[PDB]
Amino acid sequence: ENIHKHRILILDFGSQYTQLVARRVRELGVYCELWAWDVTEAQIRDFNPSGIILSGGPESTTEENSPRAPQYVFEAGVPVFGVCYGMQTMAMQLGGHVEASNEREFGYAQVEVVNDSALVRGIEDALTADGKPLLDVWMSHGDKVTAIPSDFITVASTESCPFAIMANEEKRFYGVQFHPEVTHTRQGMRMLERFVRDICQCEALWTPAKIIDDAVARIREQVGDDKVILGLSGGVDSSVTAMLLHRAIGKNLTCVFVDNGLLRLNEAEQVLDMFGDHFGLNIVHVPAEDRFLSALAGENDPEAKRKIIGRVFVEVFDEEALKLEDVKWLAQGTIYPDVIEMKMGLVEPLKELFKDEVRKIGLELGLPYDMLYRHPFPGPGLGVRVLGEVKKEYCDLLRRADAIFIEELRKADLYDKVSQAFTVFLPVRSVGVMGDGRKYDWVVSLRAVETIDFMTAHWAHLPYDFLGRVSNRIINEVNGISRVVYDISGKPPATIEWE
Amino acid sequence: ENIHKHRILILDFGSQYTQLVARRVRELGVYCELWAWDVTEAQIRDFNPSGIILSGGPESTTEENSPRAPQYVFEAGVPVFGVCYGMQTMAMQLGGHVEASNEREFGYAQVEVVNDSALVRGIEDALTADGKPLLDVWMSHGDKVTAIPSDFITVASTESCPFAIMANEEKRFYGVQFHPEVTHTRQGMRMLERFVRDICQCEALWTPAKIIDDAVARIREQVGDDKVILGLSGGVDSSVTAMLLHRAIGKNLTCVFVDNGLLRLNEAEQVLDMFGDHFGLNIVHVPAEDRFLSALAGENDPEAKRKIIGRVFVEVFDEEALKLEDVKWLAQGTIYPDVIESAAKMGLVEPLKELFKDEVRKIGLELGLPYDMLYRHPFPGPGLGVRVLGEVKKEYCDLLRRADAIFIEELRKADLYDKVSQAFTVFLPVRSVGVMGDGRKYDWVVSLRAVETIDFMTAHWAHLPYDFLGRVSNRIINEVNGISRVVYDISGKPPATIEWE
Amino acid sequence: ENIHKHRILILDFGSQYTQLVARRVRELGVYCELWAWDVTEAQIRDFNPSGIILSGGPESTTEENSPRAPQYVFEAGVPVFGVCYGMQTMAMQLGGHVEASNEREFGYAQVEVVNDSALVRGIEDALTADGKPLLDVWMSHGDKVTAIPSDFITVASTESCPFAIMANEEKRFYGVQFHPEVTHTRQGMRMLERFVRDICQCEALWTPAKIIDDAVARIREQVGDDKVILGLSGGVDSSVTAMLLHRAIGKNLTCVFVDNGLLRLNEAEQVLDMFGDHFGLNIVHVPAEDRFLSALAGENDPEAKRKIIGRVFVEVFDEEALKLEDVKWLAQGTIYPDVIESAAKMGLVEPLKELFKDEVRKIGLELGLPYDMLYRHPFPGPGLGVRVLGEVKKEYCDLLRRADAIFIEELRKADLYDKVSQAFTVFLPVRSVGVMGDGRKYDWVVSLRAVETIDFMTAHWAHLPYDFLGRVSNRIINEVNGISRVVYDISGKPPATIEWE
Amino acid sequence: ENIHKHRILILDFGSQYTQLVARRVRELGVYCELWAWDVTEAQIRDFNPSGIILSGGPESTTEENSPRAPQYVFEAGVPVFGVCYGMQTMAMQLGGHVEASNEREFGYAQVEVVNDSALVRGIEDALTADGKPLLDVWMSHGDKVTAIPSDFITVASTESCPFAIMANEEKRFYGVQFHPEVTHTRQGMRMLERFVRDICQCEALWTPAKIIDDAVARIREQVGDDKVILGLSGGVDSSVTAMLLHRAIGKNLTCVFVDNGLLRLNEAEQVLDMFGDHFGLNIVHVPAEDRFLSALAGENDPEAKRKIIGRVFVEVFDEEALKLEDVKWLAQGTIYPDVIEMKMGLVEPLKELFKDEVRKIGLELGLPYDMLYRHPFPGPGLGVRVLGEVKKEYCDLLRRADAIFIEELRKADLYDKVSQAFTVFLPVRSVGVMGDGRKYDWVVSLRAVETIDFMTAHWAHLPYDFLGRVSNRIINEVNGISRVVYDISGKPPATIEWE
Ligand SMILES: Nc1ncnc2c1ncn2[C@@H]1O[C@H](COP(=O)(O)O)[C@@H](O)[C@H]1O
Ligand SMILES: Nc1ncnc2c1ncn2[C@@H]1O[C@H](COP(=O)(O)O)[C@@H](O)[C@H]1O
Ligand SMILES: [Mg+2]
Ligand SMILES: [Mg+2]
């Protein structure tokens, strides 16, 4: 009945969708872990998985140096699901044949189900002209599975792929050549569920409410009646951590909030108000705007500024951490993605969770929706949003302008449309407004992206009229700003942030 | 395990969203019934609700004979949740005072939580300047509630609405002046869940899987070993009914499928093949195209065409029912909304009578049906009989099937199919200079029709992308021999109707 | 000054732009005529041109007995300007060479000027670092000119075309492989002007004002004091003819306006009131709606309908004519293109026989006619008779006549009228359901047709804005009792036509 | 022949359209001058106008000290034509009644001709249902004319404006409440032609060819055989001035071209090659890049930079003037709008001309179309386009980056779609090309506006496709640039240029 009882082991062969697969299983209410393919029978059997999923991977199975699944995987006695590369490698290691091809395929297709299988019985999206089941899927196949292991049957086929789905109903081995984890596969979720809950027989115990109970229980057994310290950044991870700890150990939790004077408009106030006033947490608020600024004085180098900011934060925190008596633990908002890729113990209650799961438990814990589902803010904050040397004047101008930008983005039902959106301050002067009495004022640049790939972002084609409303506002109401420009650079060639 | 044990009762005061409240509760996994507000205590006691919800309504509690909830509602000893008007009448009937108002608020607002309540505890959408809780809601208040009953407390307020949420935690009576059932209320579902699951303590047993098992058990007990007949139209309700009846009684089910020559391209083949060959259902196939067409020969009045098609259908179905022996029951795909509306030799088996259409589709999926068939835009009863203007002729019917097929194929490829409530083609018996190739001096015309239905009285013509429109237009004229021109319906509802006949 | 004195002769080799060449010369204020390439030295000598232009053409000089310019063209002693094929025939006839090739070219290019010429001197769109003038031109060449006559020089060149402009300055022979008559050649009008005004030494005497004075003179000379009759149709040619004659002979002119009941909203009265009340012309108004509709009753075929309307008009007009005494002349609004095309009891007066349509419009304005009437998109001769598909009934005419007025009013009200080539409404003889407020169920349908002409063979259905369309259909259905629905034609040309029938 | 014999006097009451009115009169082939309304009778008399036009103006005849046409205007014996406020003050001053209104009308309307007038006889755009004459006009109704002088007749009316056109055929006074100079008024031009040519009896002698002859004759009369010096900039006005002077005095003209180092890519070469070789002009080339940069070094204030550049140019030019023997005249390309807005005499051949007229005569004199119709280039060049300190290094990077921008615009057929288009150099750095490129390069901004009024310019909504294409070119091609941004600031609140 422990929520980790039934679990899925997912072996990563390098696909870009592997974390997506793991996240989907979590969404279905089943715990799972994601490991690299190069493991041992020892590890695997130590884990004791209810079922194993082999992901996709860019490499070719026809290669001599190409990755394979540990033979124990197929000997463990639990269902296995191969996705693309996982399906190819499954064929290889079991008797099938595969040969390479220069041109690869990746896109929507409709496959026809020609045989009954536990995995897809009753799951059909469309019908052929003669009433045969078709599944709309998101294909992905490089190598050519020319033959499958003798034990298997052909479950589904399509023009560009005769073995679109293969299965061994007795051994419970299934392989597909499309991605069920991508929404393009219309009934993909339903296929993953079929395997995880029906075939592997896992109950849906991994739900936000149960995750919270388990976390609280664990924090209690680890920390007992000891005191814990935690740095509150105002961000998502540390905020949810603060709530979990507050729930588990109450008055033994002390939080430290360092105000470096590099945060957004009203950010410091809202953080202390919500946490200290509304929730009643004990917060040590350090007003260090001066300490950070004086340490940044005359520094134009971005590498340098970041280092300075990071160093001074540790000095301030360590100082405070030393003023507290009987503190035996440091709490941290570490999340699973981080794990995947004085002398105080370390408490990390979010360690097994994906960002999306953290938002869900955050809500259940009573945190505001808007704070949890907002765009990320860098660690150095406005320290890198201000090009060159950082002065208070600039930061004050910047947060006012960025506030207006964000206000209008949410108001224009556009905030959820962009992956990230910020304002950069340009240390240059141009002809200004007739009210400020300033001939020349400072300049700012808006930056909205659409991170298509983890390494490839697109510059947001924000509506012209929208941009014009924004531009007018920032120049009119934010005294000290003459004009506004918009970043029309993608990644590549440019980077998302300027520094 | 009785999936109907925990149940919610929803009294309708006339709100446009009442059925929507009922569907959210079914989505949450709890059985519920929707009734008119004018009921008796005896009826409520019979139902024995685990909780009660008083919907919104266009009326005013200040009016002399305005609707009111039966008083037993507040004496049943179960939780009560009043939405908008249901909140206003709860105030009035328990000691509060409402004030009449002509100007009414209906739109997005942020209310500030100022007191604790089991209803909204832990639910926050944003923060005020001092970090106090805010909820993003879809407000709706006509008259001005000026005083809540003495035993209640203000849970949340707003500028124009002093008492946005009121509660009597001891009695478990809550009233909100906004609609949690609409998506504009960011955490509305969570609030409905708080009420149905936590406060009313209802288990969530009303799921697609258990609903099927329940339906089957009921079918087996009511029909036993009798033979049952069903008219298979290929539509959603009859298709799901067929699958449920099949699972329950197997071989004792006989489906009668009548091909009236007014269905779409390959529709009759797909139905016959999927049902008979794929699923193994016992189907009596009646090829009746000629019989329907002859009957429609020379009829121009659409009012008459409708009457004819319906008339010939009953004849045919009856003729077939008479050829079968020992058939004691007639199965029908009647759904809950048909019953609610009707509330406003052979016995009858109605397996879907308690379900809303979205639930029917969910169970259809579980039963193995194709997604595209279940989520297909509605198709009129007399089919293409009302899609072909005036006299229906086989020639016109086959041309229309061809053009319609292209129009739908393209909509799907373009990810536009689900962007419209309905989309079809109408055949116009008018001449347009023929296409060089077809060899005719003149060919026919078809009109594309696509709308976004706002409500059952308002629908807007879809602003489909010009390139898409030119692509379809081109394909139809070039591919369907016999059609030389394509037009697009730019008439909305009102003043025009969705269908042309 | 005789405005016909200095004139240009244009030989037509079959280009779609030949009339455009002629129109541009007219715009430069010089009289010109367009003849077939197959003429004699004798005919050319009688005309005595100050210059000669050889137009483009789809044929090939390499083919046996292909078109050639009369050799007198190159011996006349006047400048000659050959355009595309005309330049190729120039090269072939004077000692150059052309290689056949089916790989044609029709598009934008920049030619580089490598030598001085009276034709391009001081005319350039840009310069090259090299120091050479550049001309942005609309190229067009199929066959490949491999050699120019030994006495010619290469004036300009481009990658794909080494001899883009050739010339013999002494003889004043010039040839280009681009069309300067199309606006795509930025400096084209400028080149044509250098040739016409500077090289051929032709002063600009052919202007609207002077054309009017010349026409009036010629009319008074021909008709003298006789009486003239003219049928007023409401169109451009007869209207300008009317005003011209009114100015020439005043009271001696009698106009006959036959009211066939097939005109637009308020048209017949505007004609009568403007020409009668405002300009004071003698107008015999002949009511003939009933005569036309009776003769149109039961007629469905478009070709038949066209024949009927034309027949009845001749009948009505001739009857009214015999009723008149002393009339010895019938005035007609024949324009130059009618004559050009034709090239393949009482006298006839035709004051517009030398003018192109755009010249007729310019003189109309000078004569005081309304701009909108003159620059109006084309209206068919049989009018509504063909816009009302099927049998022409008065009820239908009056319905179309109203729906169209609104469509047009809205186009103009939205400054969209000038953005389309043609725009009109078609009456569909099919009914539709819907009019809620009226309580009326089945009414007629109309189709809106708006296109953008790209070429004589190709036209695009206009991408008119959605809200403009919604506005129009809304007004139409609501303001025209009898119309329940409005559709919009989304058929391009090809595969479809502009007019329906 | 005297092409100045017949001329129209135009009195400006402050409308943005007044200059457009003068231009229309020149287009019709008649000479005219634009003056401010506040002149005396002696001045008007000295001008001896053939006709007088009274323009619009934002004011209202109702305010006490409101602009009034000088009384003589109505007593000169020549026709008078009032437009909008010009009509209003005409009504007022001659006896009609007008009355203030808070709101003002500006849009399309149709006015019905109710009476015959020399101004509108034979001019009609549409017909009423009764076949009565209508004119489609661009209505601009400010105050309300509630009455007209006793000797005037209503010529046209509209519901919302009873006195759309008023006339006194006897005295030849006409007033309209719409703008004939705008194309929205269908036959507006024919109305102006009717006034200027028929009613005023003015011949159309003000033509490009006749103006050229008149100019050459005046230059010769003013200069004789004296030598003339002219600064050749490569811009439209100096180029047309040089060609005029070349035609008038040949070899006696020496053009001095100063390369200040703040010019565009290959501009210097282009000017010399074109005017020197192609047109055969005597050019004195002055390479002064180092003299300008040294004087610009260190300086960062734009007001200071423009001043330095102007100073050093006079220094360089004067030095050369002194080196030349027998130079008695300095020729300048001053044009009419400028006027409306060892020592030697001035020769200003283009002083009476508007910019569009200068262009038509330029084409006549053989200059290329694209150079005559190119967007304006600031006298300070890249000096005010390289923000802050100007370094050759920055100007060099900018030319390449701007060359690509204009190259792309011309191709996409967008160049003639905007009034101005340039690139600005921002002295701020950003992260550069990944892997093999530079880590920290500079940033540049694109700027493209569509001028709506002299003090009003909208930022061009350039296509997203185009903007992306350009950003890419500049970044990867221009070595030293890493980010391209687009100025989204209209005017107001911002200016067109940055310095
Ligand atoms: N302003 C701050 N005050 C206190 N702790 C902070 C602050 N900023 C960052 N931290 C801590 O640094 C951790 C990492 O932040 P991030 O850089 O967003 O991953 C947060 O989870 C906090 O525990
Ligand atoms: N309704 C009519 N009444 C009088 N004359 C007409 C009428 N329709 C056509 N005509 C005459 O026939 C000529 C042919 O014009 P259309 O057929 O419109 O090109 C017109 O210019 C008139 O001279
Ligand atoms: Mg005609
Ligand atoms: Mg200048």
Domains of chain D (ranges plus CATH)? 7-204 (3.40.50.880), 205-374 (3.40.50.620), 391-498 (3.30.300.10)
Would you state the structure tokens that stand for residue B210, as one six-digit string?
């258990």
Number of A to D CB contacts under 8 A, please give it: 106
What's the full length of chain A, in residues? 499
SS (H, E, C) C369-388: CCHHHHCCCCCCCCCHHHHE
* Closest ligand 2 atom to C238 CA: 21
Question: Whole-angstrom Cα distance, residue A411 to residue B102?
Answer: 29
- The chain C residue lying nearest D278, using CA atoms, is C131
Spatial CA neighbour of B255 closest among B225, B235, B275, B278 = B275
Two tokens at A451?
A: 């991170």
From the candidates A6, A141, A179, A246, give the one annotated as an active-site residue: A179
Residue D439 CB coordination number (10 Å): 12
Chain breaks in chain D (C to N over 2.5 A) after: 341
Single-letter amino acid, residue B130: D
Cα separation, D120 vs C336, whole angstroms: 31
Residue C319, C-beta contacts closer than 8 angstroms, at least 6 positions apart:
none
* Euclidean distance between CA atoms D346 and B10, whole angstroms: 94
How far is the centre of ligand 1, averaged over its atoms, from the C-alpha of C72 (Å)?
96
Cα D261 to chain centroid distance, Å, stands at 27
Which ligand is closest to the CA of A231, given by its number? Answer: 1
Nearest chain D residue to A463 by CA distance is D461
Say yes or no for a CB contact (<8 Å) between A428 and D429. Answer: no
Catalytic-residue membership of B32: no
Q: Does any CB of chain C come closer than 8 Å to the CB of residue D410?
A: no
Beta-strand runs (E) in B222-335: 227-232, 253-259, 283-287, 327-331
Helix (H, G, I), strand (E, B) or coil at A8: strand
Among C432, C439, C422, C501, residue whose Cα is nearest residue C473: C432
- A329, A346 Cβ separation under 8 angstroms: yes
Collect all residues of chain B within an 8 Å Cβ-Cβ radius of residue C491: 473, 477, 484-487
CA of B493 to the centre of ligand 2 (A): 43
Distance (Å) from the alpha carbon of D466 to chain A's nearest alpha carbon = 11
b/e A21-43 (16+ beta carbons within 10 angstroms → b): bbbbbbbbbbbbbbeebebeeee
Helices (H) and strands (E) in chain C — how many of each? 15, 21
Number of H helices and E strands in chain B, helices first, is 14, 21
| Ligand 1 atom with the shortest distance to the CA of A237 | 21
Question: Rounded CA gap, D466 and A471, in Å?
Answer: 21
Hey, which residues 231-260 in chain D have their CB within 8 Å of chain A?
none
H-run or E-run covering A43: helix A41-47
Tell if the CB–CB gap between B470 and C490 is shorter than 8 Å. Answer: yes
Residue labelled with tokens 């000797």: D151
Cα dihedral value A338, A341, A345, A347, nearest 10: 30
Name which of B122, B186, B269 is nearest A129 (Cβ-Cβ): B269
Ligand 3 geometric centre to CA of D113 (Å): 29
Q: How far apart are CA B214 and CA C22, in angstroms?
A: 87
Contact A368, B133 (CB under 8 A): yes
Between CA B198 and CA B191 the distance in angstroms is: 10
**Inter-residue contact B182 to B193 (CB < 8 Å):** no
Distance CA A91, CA A60 (A): 13
CA distances from C209 to C22, C212, C213 (A): 19, 5, 7
- Tokens representing residue B310 in the block: 């319906």
Give every CB contact of residue A410 below 8 A, 6+ residues apart in sequence: none
Pocket of ligand 2 (CB under 6 A): C 231-233, 235, 237-238, 256-258, 260, 313, 333, 381
How far apart, in whole angstroms, are the C-alpha atoms of residue D276 and residue D287?
16
Check if the beta carbon of residue B449 is closer than 8 Å to that of residue B462.
no
State yes or no: is A32 an active-site residue: no
Asked if the peptide bond before residue C494 counts as cis, ω within 30 degrees of 0, the response is yes
Strand segments (E) across C273-394: 282-287, 327-331, 347-349
* C371 Cβ neighbours under 8 A, 6+ residues apart: C365, D124, D125, D126, D186, D187
Q: Could you tell me the distance, in angstroms and rounded to a whole number, from the CA of residue C374 to the centre of ligand 3?
A: 12
Which residues on chain C are in Cβ contact (under 8 Å) with B497? Answer: 432-434
Task: Centre a 10 Å sphere on the Cβ of residue C398 and count the other Cβ atoms it contains.
Answer: 15
Transcribe B338-398 into DSSP letters: HHHHHH---EEE-TTTT--HHHHHHHHHHTT--HHHHTSPP--TTGGGGTB-SS--HHHHH
What lies within 8 Å, CB to CB, of C62 at 6+ separation is: C98, C99, C100, C143
Tell me the CA distances in angstroms from B237 to A121, B252, C477, one per residue in order.
22, 20, 36
Who's near C103: CB < 8 A, 6+ residues apart?
C142
Biggest CA pair distance of chain B = 85
Instruction: Give the resolution to one decimal, in Å.
Output: 2.2
Residue with tokens 């300086």: D299
* Residue A461 one-letter amino acid: H
Element (H, E) at A385: none
Phi, psi at D104, each rounded to 5°: -130, 150
> Shortest CA distance to D443 belongs to which of D456, D459, D457, D425?
D425
Q: Is D220 on the interface with C (CB under 8 A)?
A: no
Two structure tokens written together for C91: 């090269």
Contact D179, D138 (CB under 8 A): yes
Establish whether chain D is in contact with chain C, requiring a minimum of 3 CB pairs below 8 angstroms: yes
Contact call for residues B417 and C481 (beta carbons, < 8 A): no
Residue D173 near residue D86, CB atoms below 8 Å: no
β partners of residue C283: C255
Strands B97-99 and B51-54: unpaired
Q: How does A285-295 read in b/e, with b if 16+ C-beta sit within 10 Å?
A: ebebbebbbeb
In angstroms, the CA A133 to CA A130 distance is 9
Task: Give B432's contacts in chain C (Cβ within 8 Å).
Answer: 496-497, 500-501
Nearest by Cα to C404 from C373, C447, C441, C436: C447
Q: What CA dihedral angle connects A463, A468, A469 and A470, to 10 degrees? A: 90
Centre of ligand 3 to C-alpha C354, Å, is: 15
A236 annotated binding-site participant: yes
How many Cα atoms are found within 13 Å in the side-chain-facing hemisphere of B371? 13
Phi/psi for C416 (5° steps) reads -110, -20
**Distances in whole angstroms, Cα of residue C78 to Cα of each of A146, C8, C89, D11:** 80, 10, 17, 52
Chains in contact with D via at least 3 Cβ–Cβ pairs below 8 Å = A, C
Q: Where do we find the tokens 């809601």? A: B137
Dist. CA A260–CA A382, nearest whole Å: 10
Residue of A nearest to D433 (CA): A493
User: At A105, is the secondary structure helix, strand, or coil?
Assistant: strand
Ligand with the closest atom to the CA of C337: 3
Is the bond preceding residue B495 a cis peptide, omega within 30 degrees?
Answer: yes
∠ CA B356-B360-B364 to the nearest 5 degrees?
A: 175
Closest CA to C352 of C339, C365, C342: C339
Helix, strand, coil content of chain C in percent (nearest 5): 35, 25, 40
Residue B411, both tokens:
């909509």
Q: Which residues contact A304 (CB under 8 A, 6 or more apart)?
A: none
Chain A residue whose CA is closest to B371: A125
3-state secondary structure chain D: CCCCCCEEEEEECCCCCHHHHHHHHHHCCCEEEEEECCCCHHHHHHHCCCEEEECCCCCCCCCCCCCCCCHHHHCCCCCEEEECHHHHHHHHHHCCCEECCCCCEEEEEEEEECCCCCCCCCCCCEECCCCCEEEEEEEEECCEECCCCCCCEEEEEECCEEEEEEEECCCCEEEECECCCCCCCCCHHHHHHHHHHHHCCCCCCCCHHHHHHHHHHHHHHHHCCCEEEEECCCCHHHHHHHHHHHHHHHHHEEEEEEECCCCCCCHHHHHHHHHHHHCCCEEEEEECHHHHHHHHCCCCCHHHHHHHHHHHHHHHHHHHHHHCCCEEEEECCCCHHHHHCCCCEEECCCCCCCHHHHHHHHHHCCCCHHHHCCCCCCCCHHHHCECCCCCHHHHHHHHHHHHHHHHHHHHCCCHHHCCEEEEEEEEEEEECCCCCCCCEEEEEEEEEEEEEECCEEEECCCCHHHHHHHHHHHHHHCCCEEEEEEECCCECCCCCCCC
Cβ neighbors of B456 (< 8 A, separation 6 or more) are none
Chain A: residue whose CA lies nearest to B126? A368
Angle between helices A302-323 and A289-296 (to 10 degrees): 150
* Distance in angstroms (rounded) separating the CA atoms of residues D44 and D53: 12
Contacts of B365 in chain A (CB under 8 A): 122, 190
Question: Could you tell me which residues come within 8 angstroms of residue B230 by beta carbon, excluding any fewer than 6 positions away?
Answer: B238, B241, B242, B245, B253, B254, B255, B256, B330, B331, B332
Comparing CB atoms, the residue among B436, B461, B497 nearest residue C433 is B497
Distance of alpha carbon D448 from alpha carbon D453, whole angstroms: 15
Greatest C-alpha distance within chain D: 85
Instruction: Please report which helix (H) or strand (E) contains residue B37, including its range.
Output: none
Count of Cβ atoms closer than 10 Å to residue A251 Cβ: 10
Technique of determination: X-ray
Q: Are B350 and B337 in contact (CB under 8 A)?
A: no
Torsion sign, CA atoms B233, B234, B240, B242:
positive
Query: Helices then strands (H, E): number in chain A?
Result: 15, 21
**How many other C-beta atoms lie within 10 A of the C-beta of residue D143?**
20
Residues from chain B contacting residue A270 (CB–CB below 8 Å): 127, 129, 131
Provide the annotated active-site residues of D. Answer: 84, 179, 181
Contact C399, C251 (CB under 8 A): no
Interatomic CA distance for residues C166 and C174, integer angstroms: 6
Classify residue B274 as left (phi > 0), alpha (psi -120 to 50) or beta: alpha
Amino acid at residue number A131? G
Pairwise CB contact (< 8 Å): A486 & D486: yes
CA dist B221 and C236 (Å) reads: 85
Q: Whose structure tokens read 């290669």? A: A63
- Do B490 and C473 make contact, defined as CB atoms within 8 angstroms? yes
- Tell me which amino acid residue C223 is: V
Q: Is the CB–ligand 1 distance for residue A333 below 6 Å?
A: yes
Quick one: which ligand is closest to A379's CA?
Answer: 1
- The answer to whether the CB of D439 falls within 8 A of the CB of D431 is yes
Cα diameter, chain C: 85
Residue B118, classed as helix, strand or coil, is coil
Token readout for C24 is: 């541009």
Do B and D make contact via 3 or more CB pairs under 8 A? The reply is no
CA dist., res. C328 & res. C351, Å (int): 16
Q: Ligand 4 center to residue D308 CA distance, Å?
A: 18
Q: For residues D119 and D199, is the Cβ–Cβ distance under 8 A?
A: yes
The answer to whether D32 touches D24, Cβ cutoff 8 Å, is: no
Cβ atoms within 10 Å, residue D102: 4
Q: Name C424's bridge partners.
A: C449
Q: Return the SS3 of A104.
A: coil
Residue type, D151: D
Cα–Cα distance between D11 and D53 in angstroms, integer?
6
Backbone phi and psi for residue B74, each to the nearest 5 degrees, phi listed first: -90, 10
- A258 CB under 6 A from ligand 1? yes
B84 is catalytic: yes
Q: Among residues A181, A193, A352, A357, which one is catalytic?
A: A181
Phi then psi dihedrals of residue C277, to 5 deg: -70, -45
**Residue B428 with chain C: CB contacts under 8 Å:** 428, 430, 445
DSSP 8-state class, residue C199: I
Which ligand 2 atom lies nearest to the CA of residue C379?
Answer: 18
- In this complex, the residue of B463, B478, B495 whose CB is nearest that of residue C466 is B463
| DSSP type of residue B198 | I
Smallest Cα–Cα separation from A138: which of A225, A312, A224, A17?
Answer: A17
Q: Which two tokens stand for residue C177?
A: 């492989």
B501 by DSSP, 3-state: which? coil
For tokens 């519901």, the residue is: D159
Cα separation, D144 vs D163, in Å, equals 9
**Which residue is it, tokens 């706002």?**
B454
D34: left (phi > 0), else alpha (psi -120 to 50), else beta?
Answer: beta
* Farthest-apart Cα atoms in chain A, separation: 84
How is residue A484 written in tokens?
A: 């506004």
- D282-287, strands of its sheet edge to edge: D282-287, D253-259, D227-231, D327-331, D345-347
